[PDB]
Design an enzyme around this catalytic site. Structure first.
Site, short mmCIF file in Angstrom:
data_model
loop_
_atom_site.label_atom_id
_atom_site.label_comp_id
_atom_site.label_asym_id
_atom_site.label_seq_id
_atom_site.Cartn_x
_atom_site.Cartn_y
_atom_site.Cartn_z
N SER A 28 0.85 -1.20 0.00
CA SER A 28 0.00 0.00 0.00
C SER A 28 0.87 1.24 0.00
O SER A 28 1.82 1.27 0.78
CB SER A 28 -0.94 0.00 1.21
OG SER A 28 -1.89 -1.02 1.15
N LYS A 59 10.17 -11.16 1.20
CA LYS A 59 10.74 -10.10 0.39
C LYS A 59 12.23 -9.99 0.56
O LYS A 59 12.95 -9.81 -0.44
CB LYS A 59 10.08 -8.77 0.79
CG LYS A 59 8.62 -8.70 0.36
CD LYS A 59 7.92 -7.59 1.12
CE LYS A 59 6.62 -7.18 0.62
NZ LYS A 59 5.97 -6.24 1.58
#
Ligand code: CA
Ligand code: CA
Ligand code: CA
Ligand code: CA
Ligand code: CA
Ligand code: CA
Ligand code: CA
Ligand code: CA
Ligand code: CA
Ligand code: CA
Ligand code: CA
Ligand code: CA
Lengths: 203, 203, 203, 203, 203, 203
Positions: free
Chosen positions: A91, A134
């Site tokens: 986001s 990640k």
């Protein structure tokens, strides 16, 4: 061939991190360009265009407030490098925010540093999901450093042989991201001087 | 009959390259037209319409920044010549970008030169998949030259009898593509003068 | 009863040609209507709706550029007369483009002339498959003339007793199609005057 | 019990005709309702939903053009009364078009009149198959009149004892259908005044 | 990691409450920033952007009338923390109004207090749906207090073990919300002095 | 909880009536506030913002002409209480006009009186659709009186048990609406004295 660069400095390009499927990490490079509007538009396409809009609107607040760049009279083009079904981006991704700041200021970004996190309208870096996966993707890509939100430090759990391979840098706010990734020089010093008031207001 | 032209110069038409299935290459001609918007739209249909949108938005950044054409007040029509299930086009295809520049400037494109690659919002040509199979398709079509992204040079592996049949031209950026394919003349010289600042900014 | 008319002039109706199965030709009449949008839509249904979209988007480029009709603020309704599994229509069918021009301008089309071909966004008529079988269908229907793309002239191979029965008219561009099928008169002369710049740009 | 009404006037309900199997005729009543869209949708289910879509899209062209009703901002619900495997309906069935016009205008339809035919986007009634068998079904149902496309008059071949039992009304266009089936009154007169321009344009 | 803070004081950040699906409550933090307009804009994206517009326009009326801040010459950025399909926010959400007042005045908000309700243009807090489920979400998040519209007090029905866990504060108007959540100090006292006339006008 | 108040007097709040879907009535409360413009704006959002603009512009004509309030130098905020897809409001709704007059003059409105109608720029109350269904909604809400346009008196058709439950007050003009809903007092008497010239001009 790769779609990311892992060393060197480039204007407007940032190695962000994302997830595909539920869990797998990917390097998601962002390329940004700003143009005069010839009102300006956020120009993005594909599955991640809403994240691009969030990031650009949020970074615009901080750019207007602290640097005085008239970003409302610019077109802001956001490109995601690599096309994958099922990508979930951060986001208000800090990688997109960083790419925009780099593009507007003409200050290149260190391609050896990946990053993940969400930018608040006040300049804070907010926590995100999937940080271990990640970081794993950044290691597999051969990146040197990864910037993460500080609230995600206790989410990191790397196996024995991902350990020791990448520097993990926790941050609170955007000005710290910029300190770690923008190329050192007069331009950078001038820009960081403007963001000093953001840091002072926050602490 | 063929759906591509292999010699001569035409406005708004470029011999791009794509893949069908996993691996097989095809020549994918693009035809572009620009019109006044009578906000402008990217007008495309079919399975490749997203690639058309990517290419046109990315090339628009460079057109606004470096040439000052008000492409935001134009409708941009993109046509893919040839209809095939299972075509995979180049992200932000440079063939589409080139066709748009040709259409807006009225400068014809050399039909003997095929091309593949992805256009960045900053004007770079980014690497793509399938370059060997795309070159093979260009040879089978009787094309004279193929432009590829420079990072794909080491991906080329041609059999004994595809060798020596086509010139392979690696490029870094869009202005090099234009140098190789636009018809020589005053119009071209004027346009390339504008893109000089893109090359200077990049190197 | 038939579903096509073979003589006379009608607004918005064109005798196109298509294939069914792999090889068999059919007459595929198109009926178009344009309405105010009360943004406008392309309104089509069935198996050929994508060809309708291609044709209408491509003809819209030429209509905006050369005639200045605000077709973007119109709804464009395309009807295919005759319903058959397995019909393959011409990409961007020139019959559909012609029907739209006729409908917008109120200029009737000669029902004795069939046509096949694909419309480019620049106004060129591009070659198509199955031209012999389509001409055979036009002869069996009692049509007087058939317009084909010029690059398909060498694809025609008619048996002894299809020979001499229909006039075959090769074309390069849409303005030639219109010259052959629109009813002669002041309206037609005015319209063709606008498309003169398309012909000049092309040659 | 029957599924059709054979006398009287009802809003939104029309006695259409169809075929089952190859040849046998059936009465196929249609019921339509229009609602605000709260873009509007064509809401239909079952084996005939494509015919419903064709009819509603085609009638929408004429409604927008000649009456100015904003049918694009309505939901249009089409119901087929009676469920049968193997029903073949009329392309763009005029019964469906009529039901929609009745529903939007609030003008009831004569249930003693059956109809068959296909509606063009220009308002013409196009010929259909099976007209003899459809007329036979209307006679067996006790209907008083049947509207057919004029080009199907020479397709009618009734045995000695279907003769003299039903009035057969050939039509060219939708406004003639409406003249024969809508209930006489001020509403009807107002509506027909709008469709006058369709008749003038056609003749 | 969490996306809300549950203790402490922060400028421009409020723990609002919303519903997902029909019934389930969520904590929906809002972050606001105001900038000079360099006319000002309400800058919001996503599914809740209309609620953001309502809240900011409504709070602007009270800000102009009672405090005299020139909010019409500001850009107002609203960020919703947390992205969920199916979120239903409070019309004119008081959490958004509060965040804007905090951001403009530089007065931090107590993160231990959640709130729900709709702001009227006159400063009243209007009732909302789902208050029990929203209180449950606040308890599950570890918040200390929840502000609700007074007309929703009789809507609260908590099970035995949600009881006693959170303070529920009914309010009539915005100035009461501010009294409960803004950090005590000179700035707050000055601001509340201005809103005194709102309270007097209302009672 | 309800979103309307049904008894008592409040500044700037009026119980208007609207329709949802085609036919169902709803109570649609309006809240208005006026502020100095710090040119003034009409500030409204959502699906009904055009009705708000119509009402406020129309009432502004009468306010300027007959009362001399400088409403052109005010911001006028209009809020619709209750959010529903598919609401159809009254053109130039008299409820909105009334709320604005109340807000500017500081004179409260009787919450037990609902109203429907359209305000003309000359002060007349023009007829509207759905008056029976709107009266039904007012009865179901427990309101005491409903103001309607006089030309809609013959549109009212209430079932046996909606009869006798609400007073129906037909009006010609805005000053009659105000007489029925503004709280009695010196302020009201002063305001009505100004609108006397409107009544005299009209009759
Ligand atoms: Ca280390
Ligand atoms: Ca570290
Ligand atoms: Ca060579
Ligand atoms: Ca070479
Ligand atoms: Ca001949
Ligand atoms: Ca010939
Ligand atoms: Ca008779
Ligand atoms: Ca007859
Ligand atoms: Ca307590
Ligand atoms: Ca309490
Ligand atoms: Ca009474
Ligand atoms: Ca009465």
């Amino acid at each position: 061939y790769k779609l990311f660069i892992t060393e060197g400095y480039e204007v407007g390009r940032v190695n962000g991190l994302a997830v595909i499927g539920e869990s797998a990490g990917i390097v998601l490079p962002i390329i940004a360009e700003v143009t005069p509007s010839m009102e300006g538009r956020v120009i993005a396409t594909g599955r991640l265009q809403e994240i691009a809009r969030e990031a650009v609107m949020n970074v615009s607040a901080i750019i207007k407030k602290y640097t005085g760049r008239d970003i409302s009279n610019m077109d802001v083009h956001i490109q995601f490098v690599g096309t994958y079904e099922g990508v979930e981006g951060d986001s208000a991704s800090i990688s997109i925010a960083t790419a925009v700041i780099s593009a507007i200021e003409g200050i290149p970004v260190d391609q050896s540093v990946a990053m993940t996190g969400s930018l608040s309208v006040k300049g804070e870096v907010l926590p995100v999901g999937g940080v271990t996966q990640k970081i794993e993707a950044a290691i597999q890509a051969g990146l040197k450093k990864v910037i993460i939100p500080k609230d995600n430090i206790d989410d990191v759990l790397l196996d024995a042989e991902h350990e020791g391979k990448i520097e993990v840098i926790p941050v609170s706010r955007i000005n710290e991201v910029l300190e770690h990734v923008l190329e050192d020089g007069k331009k950078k010093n001038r820009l960081m001087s403007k963001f000093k008031e953001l840091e002072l207001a926050a602490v």
